[PDB]
Design a protein around this ligand. Structure first.
Ligand SMILES: Nc1nc2c(ncn2[C@@H]2O[C@H](COP(=O)(O)OP(=O)(O)NP(=O)(O)O)[C@@H](O)[C@H]2O)c(=O)[nH]1
Ligand SMILES: [Mg+2]
Ligand code: NA
Length: 167
């Protein structure tokens, strides 16, 4: 069957790991256990095609940027995650994209922009519009997600597989 290697990137604390564990294990990680690097494997069916997903969960903290560089290099597509309560997490997305394109040595790489923590409406400071504006500037799909409420979790990983399929 077809294997897809998906990498989750974005700054520290935005919910990378929680989104991964929702996808893999259908439960919400309430603790913040910061990642250096973890990987997971799941067999799924996407558009009635047999798939194997390899998910690389990477460190968002800046002190680990070089380890992240190395682990990213086997990725085929990327989830670029910010959180809607943090404009700084969105502003850092530009640098994550840049790092992705440099490590893959390509002008375009399958990737989707993910504004996580959308259940935190009381804390929102990035509008859906503002997220959609960043994705539009890079010609990539956009989705708001919630690891806590299970909103668009499967959707975001599966759409990334569809981005990889057309690459
Ligand atoms: N309210 C809410 N909290 C979330 C959501 N996703 C993750 N969190 C919370 O945010 C914290 C950080 O989550 P985590 O997935 O560890 O962040 P990360 O992006 O992997 N951090 P790192 O880059 O350091 O490994 C955790 O307490 C977690 O419960 C969400 O969708 N909504
Ligand atoms: Mg993590
Ligand atoms: Na730990």
């Amino acid at each position: 069957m077809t294997e897809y290697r998906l990498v989750v990137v974005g700054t520290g604390g935005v919910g990378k790991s929680a989104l991964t564990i929702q996808l893999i294990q259908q439960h919400f990680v309430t603790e913040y256990d910061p990642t250096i690097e973890d990987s997971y494997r799941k067999h799924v069916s996407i558009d009635d095609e047999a798939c194997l997903l390899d998910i690389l969960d990477t460190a968002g903290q800046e002190d680990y940027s070089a380890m992240r560089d190395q682990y990213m290099r086997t990725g085929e597509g990327f989830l670029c995650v910010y959180s809607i309560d943090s404009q700084q997490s969105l502003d850092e997305i530009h640098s994550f994209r840049e790092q992705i394109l440099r490590v893959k040595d390509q002008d375009e790489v399958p990737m989707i922009l993910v504004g996580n923590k959308c259940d935190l409406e009381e804390h929102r400071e990035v509008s859906t519009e503002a997220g959609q504006a960043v994705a539009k500037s890079y010609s990539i799909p956009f989705m708001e997600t919630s690891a806590k409420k299970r909103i668009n979790v499967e959707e975001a990983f599966y759409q990334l597989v569809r981005e990889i399929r057309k690459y």
